Structure formats: C-alpha cells, structure tokens
Design an enzyme around this catalytic site. Structure first.
Site, short mmCIF file in Angstrom:
data_model
loop_
_atom_site.label_atom_id
_atom_site.label_comp_id
_atom_site.label_asym_id
_atom_site.label_seq_id
_atom_site.Cartn_x
_atom_site.Cartn_y
_atom_site.Cartn_z
N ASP A 124 4.95 -10.55 -0.33
CA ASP A 124 4.24 -9.70 -1.27
C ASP A 124 5.21 -9.26 -2.37
OD1 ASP A 124 1.43 -9.11 -1.15
OD2 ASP A 124 1.84 -7.00 -0.73
N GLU A 161 4.95 -11.11 -10.90
CA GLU A 161 4.28 -11.96 -9.92
C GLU A 161 4.18 -13.40 -10.40
OE1 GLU A 161 2.10 -10.21 -7.20
OE2 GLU A 161 0.77 -11.87 -6.68
N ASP A 187 0.31 -11.73 -1.12
CA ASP A 187 0.37 -12.55 -2.34
C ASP A 187 0.55 -14.01 -2.00
OD1 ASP A 187 -0.03 -10.36 -4.07
OD2 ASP A 187 2.12 -10.00 -4.27
N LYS A 191 6.25 -6.59 -5.18
CA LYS A 191 6.06 -5.20 -5.55
C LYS A 191 7.01 -4.80 -6.67
CE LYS A 191 3.87 -3.94 -1.27
NZ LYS A 191 2.62 -4.04 -2.08
#
EC number: 3.1.21.4
Lengths: 244, 244
Positions: free
Chosen positions: A89, A44, A73, A91
């Site tokens: 997002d 991330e 996110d 993942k």
DNA sequence: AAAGATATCTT
DNA sequence: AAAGATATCTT
C-alpha cells in the site's frame, strides 16, 4: 531479496526523477497542485512501474484492485504460493519544515482486519506480509506561474509544489501506533515520529500478533475506550488482568 | 459573461485535449490509473489554467485554499467587491455506459452551510454564487492499466483510462437532490439522472432558499429522519406542521 | 437507501 | 487527541 531490491529501486527512482505535471496526448502540460490529494495520486502512479519491474524479476505477478475501494494498492504472489500473497500500500504525508515529525493513516481497523473478505482483493488470510511504501514531502506554496499551461520544451521550467521527497518501505505492523489515525473513517494510526524511526522500525508493538489483537479490539470512541484501553500501556494491563 | 465564457472554454479544452499521463522534468512519462481518485485529481489540474485565464479576462482574482480541507476549489473575486465572491468546485463521477443515470456528492451538509466560517476559505456569507464544474467519464472495460513508462515520442501509444469525457457547469442548488450522497461523511446528494438533466438544470428544489433550508435541517441518520423528513415531500409537510 | 468503506487532514 | 472535516464509492 524482493524487499531489498524493491526499496533499492524506489529510493533510486526518487533520486533521479521529479514529477512536474500531467501531459496530454497532444503534448500540452498542466502543472501540479499543492494538495496531498494530488501528491498522493502522483506518488502512487510513480511507484507502479517500479513495483511491477521488481516483482517480475522475482517471478511475482502484480494485481491491482478489480473493484474500487478494495485494499491493497498492489497484490503480489507467485502462482506456486497462492497463500503467500504480499500486500503493498502506498501512503503519503507532508512536512512543513524539513524533518519535522510525521504520521500516517494505516488503513481501516474495521474492514479486512476484522472480516477476512471485507474490502480486500483477496481473503485476508491468504496474505503473509503487509508492506507500506511511505512518501514524505516538504510543502512548497503555489504561485502565479503554476496556473498556466506548458509545452514539452519548457519541462525544466515548471514550478513544483514540493521539495525533499523521501521514501521508506516497512511492514505495516512495525510502524503502527496505538492511537487512531482518523475518527469517522476509523483508521489505524502510525507512530508519530521522525522519518528515521520509520526506516529503522521503531514502533510500539512487540509482535504482529500484538498489533492485530490491539486493533481488532480497539473501541471506536473515547467514551468506549475509557472503560477498556486507549493506549499500549492500558492494553498491556488489560491483557494482564485477563482481557477485562 | 464570466459564466458563459467559462462554460465555453471548458467545453473547448475538453474537446481538444486528452490527458494521458504524469511527466517528470527529465521527460519520462508514467501512465494513469483507472480510479475516480486518479481522475478527479486529473480533471481538477486540467481545469486550473482554464479557470484562471477566463477569470483574468473578466478581472477576477483567483484564490485556492491555503489550508487542505477547506472548500471551495477556486474562489473568484474582484478587489472592488469583496462580498460578491464566486465559489467553484470540481466534481467527478463515472458511467458504465453512455446514457446511464449518474449522481454526485455535493459537499458536506454540516460544515460551512451550518457554520459561516467552518471549513471554508472565506466566510460563507461573502459568496454570492456556488458553481459545480462536473466531469463525467466513461469507464474502460480493461482492468489492467499499463505498468510501463514512456518517452515523449510515444505519447500516442499510452492507453487512456477513459472511453469518453463530458463536462458541465451548473449552480449547486439546481442539481441538488434530497437524499444524502454519503453517510459517515455527511455529504449532500445530487439528483440521480441523465447527463442532460444536469446541463438543463432539471432539479427538484423550487429555490436556493429551499435547498439551503432542506440541507441545514436534514438529520444525519434514518432513525432521526423518520421523525422529521427523509425526502422533499416530507420536508414540505414538515414546513406545514410548523417546523416540528 | 442507508451506512460505512476507500486516503489523509485540521482544530 | 479525538472527532469530524476534505471527495466518492459500494455494500
């Protein structure tokens, strides 16, 4: 496009840089652990600057959650298109052997997908696209040399808990599956397939409308799904009969 | 002792270094996010080398979970005494202001405390101590972390995602409370109090026996708990009634 | 509070 | 698979 430039940049950054630890302001380096909790966090933070750079080139501003535990996110949008926001997002999942089948948890099915303003930075109806940046890594067992501290001059010597990281960028509805990704935390499950299936978009839903209707009416337990639907075949029959 | 040398080393390391980012083998540095999800990972990685160094000094082997959802973070044990294992778990939480009460989630109440071999690296009856290393950070007001990358000569320019950090080492039973720390993920709750209370061990249980019995018989919902016990006083009345 | 959100995994 | 584990937060 924004999407093609973003996946080009993510793919390239993945190819040229390998994260190997956390560093202090004083210069001391702490090696990485083997969890997915650790690598999910690392990937991330590794994506953040890339997303911001590409978004900025298409005149998009990037907003991260103001409150904790709010999807997504990253929220991208031009000020001139307030109701055309893009949700991104990140993942992550693992692989024991390189290229085994993988699967992801795709967010809850009981929060923002059933309540416009539940656990989401902006009302759900202000987003026109929901993208998943998926990272897959092959696990590598930790050893003795990971449990000591390191200096900057030993950067290339630090052992890493992973190998063969791959990344894709795809719509959430496109890679979504028909089986829950989790039980007590009621998450949507992705398809269970090889990495190439995620890149090419070989999901099970025919449209984003079908994805949303399926997960909006999916019951939480097997006892309740027994009398309704457990999979896509059963859902399409349920629909055929008149939602009964 | 192992415990006093571990607490000293932890205080010292915390006082000396400030983690400020993730670094790649190529030398590029990516800043940290604001989350507790980011910070719990960072504090776990930061503590690793310290724990291993102090354990080696005292002649204990250190083992991390081979499986991913198994407690604890670190298992310490001497080869001579296999039934004297020590479990160390790292837990993090935040404060908005210095002297505000805090609380921790202290692990599940339905796994290894109810089943000897469930979600635990070694059988629970092989452990003679269960320590919590607790990290408490003070949130920064800023809601927009740095979205650029840095080089090794710019380390003092990187914004830190915390105002201040404090650390403690205490027994799990001593700081345990009587109210669940989570609902669907059924976690034990810690006391709700100032930082000093955790350091000083001002809990509510009279013994580790009482703490284990309390959490081994705690019902998962309000409905079920209202016929039994919801707190320490009601539990002690439950004991008086004959465990009924 | 109590209950269920945040991400991902094992058995 | 389905169900409930891993850690922590907010409604």
């Amino acid at each position: 496009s924004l999407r093609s430039d973003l996946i080009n940049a993510l793919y390239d950054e993945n190819q040229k840089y390998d994260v190997c630890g956390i560093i202090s302001a004083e210069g001391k380096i702490y090696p990485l652990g083997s969890d997915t909790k650790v690598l999910s966090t690392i990937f991330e933070l590794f994506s953040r600057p890339i997303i911001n750079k590409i978004a900025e080139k298409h005149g998009y501003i990037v907003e991260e959650p103001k409150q904790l535990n709010h999807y997504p996110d990253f929220t991208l949008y031009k000020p001139s298109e307030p109701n055309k926001k893009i949700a991104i997002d990140i993942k992550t999942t693992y692989t024991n052997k390189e290229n085994e089948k993988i699967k992801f948890t795709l967010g809850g099915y009981t929060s923002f997908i059933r309540n416009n303003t539940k656990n989401i930075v902006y009302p759900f109806d202000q987003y026109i696209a929901h993208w998943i940046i998926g990272y897959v890594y092959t696990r590598v067992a930790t050893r003795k040399s990971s449990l000591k501290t390191y200096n900057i001059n030993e950067l290339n010597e630090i052992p890493k808990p992973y190998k063969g990281v791959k990344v894709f960028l795809q719509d959430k509805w496109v890679i979504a599956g028909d089986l829950a990704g989790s039980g007590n935390t009621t998450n949507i499950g992705s398809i269970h397939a090889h990495y190439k299936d995620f890149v090419e978009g070989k999901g099970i839903f025919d449209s984003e409308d079908e994805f949303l209707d399926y997960w909006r009416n999916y019951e939480r337990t097997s006892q309740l799904r027994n009398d309704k639907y457990n999979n896509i075949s059963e859902y399409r029959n349920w629909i055929y009969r008149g939602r009964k």
